[PDB]
């Protein structure tokens, strides 16, 4: 060997100033690098008359999902650039009651975040539609018939009709079906049939 | 001194299509570690406050699942080893969010979701009555 | 400049190779963690956030009525009798299946149409007429 | 066990929601259940229960030959097999075995 054994350089933590831009050191989520973290942090159960294991060669610190990439300074700086990406919520809808008056129909959909190579999840196709019967243009006859048609889908205590659609594979297809069912149920309730006179 | 002179901001276009209104967002995060959820809660709450988003946080009761396995490879029925998988919860309740506002906040927090943590976002969308239900046709 | 470019004509290999040299001068290695995820998202290796469980999945752009209303595929079947009653259960069951595409659902419907055609003689002895 | 108004109203609801309209007994309702769900075999759990052991074993075997993977377990059997040839306990040729 012409040269000696390769010598590891001193860790770059020694070259970091006390007023350095820390978020630049950890831009994204990264595993705990002892040569990159200028903190004398120790982790591990100490032996009798012992000390917690040093950060160097520490596997326990490597298994911690550390938030070094989400320091409070970075979080406030990250949101500053994201303000242009959002939109102002309408000030007219001050409370929930104002929201109900103008938007009486509520649609519920669920999204799941899981770790893996496959993002498919059968539970995401479910679409739930809730609407109060008081906000619908219903007379006495149609309202009484609508409750019987839906059965238990209508809650008398809250006066809220809940329709759950999950037949179609896609969430958008289930959303259309929920809107379609509400349209058909409303019109069919208004329709008066000859056999209804036998009630 | 080697700072950039001019920065090219990402292109954001204000389309003519009206936005979607989300009444509530129930961001529930599940994990095996309470400290990780507490740290993730601090990140999510702080991000919401800086974005002007109303958020309320509560902790759903935890779920623990236990199952029993034989200890010895052969016989010895009376001796068992019992394992458990603790699922700890943390619910984030965002209110009065637009479609664009909820899209950015979710992307910011989902990409920063720690490993071993799953998220279930329940999105409540406000919609008006369909045009066909305005008046009866019969 | 030119009003109407020849975009319809496929560019030659010289044109394609020239464009590659244009991307070379602008090609630089990754500078930080953000640039790696940006490149992966553009290349499609990384998931697109916010998470959509139906990203890249669209079953031939089918509408909800295609999955649910399957009576248009029972025209060949008899309008009344046990066969119509039996196929009504099948269509009702198929309308409740979210794991089968519209094309797959039609295959099940077409299977009974061909099956009863082969078994016309048996059906005739039971006072049932198919086609 | 229902009146005319209740029976027809219930039947009307089934048509609206796409449920079964004609009167069907419990036995024949299984046909609805059969096509409403995937069969047991068609489920991803069933046909993909095992990992492709052909893919896993042959890939590592190929990578071992390419020298990019060192199979410590395989090197153990190769050495043990080699020592048996020196000891004479070599695998007999197929067909031309000890018994004929």
């Amino acid at each position: 060997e012409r040269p000696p054994r390769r010598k590891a350089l001193p860790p770059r933590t020694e070259k970091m100033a006390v007023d350095q831009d820390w978020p630049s050191v950890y831009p994204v989520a990264a595993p705990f690098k002892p040569s990159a973290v200028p903190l004398p942090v120790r982790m591990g159960y100490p032996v009798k008359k012992g000390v917690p294991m040093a950060k160097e060669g520490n596997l326990e610190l490597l298994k911690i999902p550390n938030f070094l990439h989400l320091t409070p300074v970075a979080i406030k700086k990250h949101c500053e650039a994201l303000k242009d990406f959002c939109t102002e919520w309408p000030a007219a809808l001050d409370s929930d009651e104002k929201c109900e008056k103008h938007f009486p129909i509520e649609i519920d959909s669920t999204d799941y975040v899981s770790s893996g190579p496959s993002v498919r999840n059968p539970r995401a196709r479910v679409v739930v539609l809730r609407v109060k019967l008081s906000s619908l243009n219903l007379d006495d006859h149609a309202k009484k018939k609508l409750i019987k048609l839906v059965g238990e889908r209508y809650c008398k205590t809250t006066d809220v009709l809940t329709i759950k659609t999950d037949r179609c594979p896609l969430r958008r297809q289930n959303y259309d079906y929920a809107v379609y069912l509400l349209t058909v149920l409303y019109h069919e309730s208004w329709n008066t049939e000859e056999w209804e006179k036998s009630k | 001194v080697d700072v950039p002179k001019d920065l090219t901001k990402p292109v954001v276009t204000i389309s003519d299509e009206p936005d979607i209104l989300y009444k509530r967002l129930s961001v529930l995060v599940k994990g095996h570690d309470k400290a990780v959820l507490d740290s993730y809660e601090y990140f999510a709450v702080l991000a919401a406050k800086e974005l002007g988003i109303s958020i309320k946080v509560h902790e759903p009761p935890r779920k623990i699942e236990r199952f029993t396995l034989l200890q010895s490879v052969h016989i010895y029925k009376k001796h068992r080893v019992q394992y458990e998988m603790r699922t700890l919860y943390r619910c984030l309740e965002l209110e009065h969010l637009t479609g664009s506002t909820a899209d950015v906040y979710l992307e910011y927090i989902q990409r920063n979701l720690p490993e071993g943590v799953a998220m279930e976002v329940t999105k409540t969308q406000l919609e008006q009555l369909p045009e066909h239900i305005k008046e009866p046709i019969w | 400049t030119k009003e109407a470019p020849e975009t319809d004509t496929s560019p030659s290999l010289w044109d394609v190779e020239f464009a590659k040299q244009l991307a070379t001068v602008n090609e630089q290695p990754l500078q930080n963690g953000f640039e790696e995820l940006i490149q992966w998202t553009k290349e499609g290796k990384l998931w697109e956030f916010p998470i959509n469980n139906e990203a890249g999945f669209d079953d031939d752009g089918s509408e909800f009525h295609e999955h649910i209303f399957l009576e248009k595929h029972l025209e060949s079947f008899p309008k009344q009798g046990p066969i119509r009653h039996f196929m009504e259960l099948v269509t009702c069951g198929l309308s409740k299946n979210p794991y089968l595409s519209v094309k797959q659902k039609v295959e099940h419907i077409e299977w009974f149409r061909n099956y009863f055609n082969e078994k016309k003689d048996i059906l005739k002895e039971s006072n049932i007429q198919f086609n | 066990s229902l009146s005319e108004y209740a029976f027809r109203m219930s039947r009307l609801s089934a048509r609206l929601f796409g449920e079964v309209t004609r009167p069907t007994n419990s036995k024949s309702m299984k046909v609805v259940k059969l096509f409403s769900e995937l069969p047991l075999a068609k489920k991803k759990e069933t046909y993909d229960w095992y990992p492709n052991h052909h893919t896993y074993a042959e890939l590592m075997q190929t990578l071992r030959f390419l020298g990019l993977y060192r199979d410590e377990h395989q090197d153990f059997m190769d050495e043990q097999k080699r020592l048996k040839k020196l000891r004479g306990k070599e695998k007999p040729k197929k067909g031309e075995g000890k018994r004929a």
Partner: peptide
């Protein structure tokens, strides 16, 4: 005892195809 009634044998009208087909859009 077999209970058969006139209304129990009446086929339900396919209102989706005929009456409410216009509602599949918008």
């Amino acid at each position: 005892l077999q209970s058969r009634k006139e209304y129990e044998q009446e086929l339900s009208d396919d209102l989706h195809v005929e009456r409410y087909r216009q509602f599949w859009t918008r």
